[PDB]
């Protein structure tokens, strides 16, 4: 929808930009912001959550050529490394693809919340905005943002601008 995103939004991570009679203005939705954060936070904590301890292991550098045993001690340690390295490449890749889809869905969700709220008093412009079909002054706007907009109130006004003129 929003083919772009807003630079200069520093109140939070997701937000509302409105325009009415009283003028334009902006404000961040803190609840869905923290929602994204708390997930990333916890995902991140599980990755960097306390590692192993290891003490007396095998030798991994060698001065002389010994043949068979040494050949095996180095194969073992190389085979280890190669696997753990794969694990780490895959982990990050997965975790990232997720961290993206997580945050894209959070935006997505806020939009729906806002659409269900406006019910039949507004239409989706196509770029992730709404054309609200009534006089929505600044009080009315925060009423939407803070989850209290009663549609049953502006129904008649809106409904009629939409289907007439």
């Amino acid at each position, epitope marked *: 929808f929003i083919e772009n995103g807003w630079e200069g939004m520093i109140d*939070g991570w997701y937000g509302f930009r409105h325009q009415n009679s009283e003028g334009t203005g902006q404000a961040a939705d*803190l609840k869905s*912001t*923290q929602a994204a*954060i708390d997930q*990333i*936070n916890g995902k*991140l*904590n599980r990755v*960097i959550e306390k590692t192993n301890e290891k003490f007396h292991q095998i030798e991994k550098e060698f001065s002389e050529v010994e043949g068979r045993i040494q050949d095996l001690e180095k194969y073992v340690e190389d085979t280890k490394i190669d696997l753990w390295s794969y694990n780490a490449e895959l982990l990050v890749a997965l975790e990232n693809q997720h961290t993206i889809d997580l945050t894209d869905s959070e935006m997505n969700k806020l939009f729906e919340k806002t659409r269900r709220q406006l019910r039949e008093n507004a239409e989706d412009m196509g770029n992730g905005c709404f054309k609200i079909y009534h006089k929505c002054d600044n009080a009315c706007i925060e009423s939407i943002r803070n989850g209290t907009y009663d549609h049953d109130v502006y129904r008649d006004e809106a409904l009629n601008n939409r289907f007439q003129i």
Partner: nanobody
Amino acid sequence: QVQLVQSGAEVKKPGASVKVSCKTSGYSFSTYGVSWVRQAPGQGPEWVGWISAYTGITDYAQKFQGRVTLTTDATTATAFLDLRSLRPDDTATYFCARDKVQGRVEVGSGGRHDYWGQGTLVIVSS
């Protein structure tokens, strides 16, 4: 620097309710929630609830639910705790403490109960 000054001891009777203030300072109030823990004399601490100063979200311990209400006032930078229907059981000393990090990037868990109120005694006697 960073501190949490709580209200002086209140004393209330079995029916009534109570409200305890926790004034904060030295850090920006809204980027950190608040955890509340109480302590019946001689026993160990038990957790009461938590509220975010960023998102207004709360999580009460299910033991109290109903009886307990957490709020915050960003202007004065204060968290409040309201407990109703006080039993004599609830006679305890009540602590607030900084907890969770809100908005900001993330982690790990570096607090998470960084700093605590000096404690505020509540006595429920008739």
